[model samples]
Target: SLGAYLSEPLTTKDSSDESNEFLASGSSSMQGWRISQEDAHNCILNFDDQCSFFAVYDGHGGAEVAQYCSLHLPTFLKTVEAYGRKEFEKALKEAFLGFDATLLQEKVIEELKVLSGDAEPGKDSGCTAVVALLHGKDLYVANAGDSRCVVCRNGKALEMSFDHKPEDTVEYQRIEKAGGRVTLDGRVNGGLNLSRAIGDHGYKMNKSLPAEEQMISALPDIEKITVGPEDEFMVLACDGIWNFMTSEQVVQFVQERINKPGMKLSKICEELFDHCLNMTAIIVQFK
Candidate 1:
């Protein structure tokens, strides 16, 4: 008998329905959909009335790590001392590394094993993470790995976070210093292609090295910006969409759909996915 390599998830989740083009609650309007073979999101639209948090996780060796991060990263961020102070960028960075660290704990390790199902625990499994936290006038984007965050302001596309790749100058130097080498094909230690991510415990084996100094650091790059009237909407997406278009192209495509009369944002989102290489997007229109 012949069968598929992996079984597909029985249910796929989406926030939008036929009635509401975009899901609207308090303080924010958002729409998210995934075309990947697996789902990869857990979000809070109005987190405590002060902020909205959204993240995109792209799982590589396994999907559990991404699912775990999406479920727990927000809570970990709230625990940081800087969170209440509105030091979002600082808190976000701490949360990413902290989440990775916690995964190594005996309890967490056991839980991940359970979550992973048939996949082996702590093998090469991991995910790329990009989180967006929108507060009062501040928008903070934190990223590890290749998922991206882009903002459209004054009809121009501005990238809030950059992809982390092994060949990047800063990332290359870091990997070399950690006793890791980038392969001819540009993978770290001839294994993982990303320079930063959560899990992938095998690459984080240098106990003496700090999190950011590890072969594949879990540390995220934090970008903070003040958004105002000039800003239109923001897009947070996994590398699927990015594999085909640049940040500018995506923003422009969305903007055109937005300008169309009677065009629902969710419809535009779905269309964007339809046109892109691999579609998984979360579009947030600010008020």
Candidate 2:
């Protein structure tokens, strides 16, 4: 029997910006390859000698938030005065919060309108983000929401970020403590489903907590790890991809293609989306 397909081809149109390249994430040219068509989402791949910058924003509600970060996080990271491990974490926090504040000040009219009334007890829209800046051998990972990152070393999968979900007892406590509740559908203040995220204007209305501490949940799950050449590329994807595939499944997909000399990054991304869109599961699998 047939099941529904959630993935669809990433629609493309003619453009002067098209490099018609192939490879995955970051600046493909740096790694001696071309990027392909399906590499959607906002990403930054700046390699300065031994350091490689890799990041992903799993956008919820809209793509603008992710795109905003994609276009700017590198420059934002460059602004930090501290390179110490702990300082990197603080800088990461500062960068995100700083960007958050900047978002509040944007004269984009629509976004500004939302920010103006954001503290109204019940209002919001936001994104889940996962970012990693790999320098030399150290990796700094920051995340909010369910989008994830994993390190595949010597063909073994090592989990990095924690998935922020509403069912956890701690998450529930945070919600109620913030004068909010998580309903059956996992929605908070009857709006957000996850425990932490970047921009939910609706849930930010409560003055009891800082934007990062709101409802005491959805705060980014950040971590750092040492990585090596054995560590395959890191993945940054939206919940849409997660809804269909497990982290292992995603990692394997990339691992298989990483050495494929002819594959393009955009096409690699497109193929992943295609797999998600085309999958058919058995009842046991869904269960």
Candidate 3:
């Protein structure tokens, strides 16, 4: 059954050109539809010839990290080719951590700019980045944070990543080992948030453990699934949407709206976002 009606504004556009060969070969992919609202969320149909693209960065502290990722991950994946076929994974891993070194330099410049009255740092914020690349029959996913991915195969939910929390076994051990304590809020291993993240200058300290490994006991898990007709739409949402909906619930929601005539994908996403807000404090920012 199609769900209840609650209209949320969405940006929905369709571009289908009769003369376009972009979507020609079966080997090619196209972003027939896409949507994103800066400072809010982003999605892309980056490659028309490859059924590939991903989403999400639950920006906390500030929006810089999440926004930076939404724009950069796709481009970085493109560069993965020159790094060598077998080295794609290695290259990606490097890029994820490598961006941090770059961010450090940029942060200094950013600070200088603020000092000189050139500008103010947008939000002194960082984000949890979750990205997936869809290439032919393979899907490469990488993440740092609670943001997540779920695949709906044959009308059921299959989670593709794990959320990183301070209490996770690995996280707990690492925090304790680091001489950090996990307090309810004031200080948990002397930190208030999870162990793994991108661009949080505050937490990026303690270089003994790599940024990605710090409190990140649940490492970014990756998967490569063969695509078939049974493979339906996937969902990549920030913790906002995740707070309220389980993978199965989200899958069922999308399934309910899949065949509706005017059911825009953008609208479908908003509905999910709404559900998230109602379900958790995670959406407090948006509400």
Candidate 3 lDDT over 1-287, as tens digits, reads 44444443333322111111211101001111232222223444445365445556655444455556655656665565533463445655666666655556765446524432322332234566666665555666776667777777877987777777776776777777766778776245564475666565555467787655554332355566755667765666666566677878878987887558965555566556555531111110000
| Cα displacement (Å) at residue 97, model 1 | 1.2
* Model number with the top lDDT: 1
- Candidate 2 regions exceeding 4 Å error are 1-40, 47-50, 81-86, 106-123, 216-218, 278-287
Against the true structure, what is each candidate's TM-score? 0.85, 0.73, 0.72
Instruction: List model 2 lDDT by residue over 1-287, tens digit each.
Output: 34453432334322111221221342111010232221223333334444555555544444455555556556776676664443777767777766655555445325434423333211244566676666556778777667776767678666677777777876777777778787888777576677766555556666767776677333466788866556665665556667888878877887777567866545556667557651111000000
TM-score of predicted structure 1: 0.85
lDDT score, candidate 1: 0.75
Better of 1 and 3 by lDDT: 1
Q: Rate the local accuracy (lDDT) of all candidates.
A: 0.75, 0.55, 0.53
As a whole number from 0 to 100, the lDDT of residue 257 in candidate 3 is: 74
Which window of 10 residues has the lowest lDDT sum in candidate 1?
A: 20-29
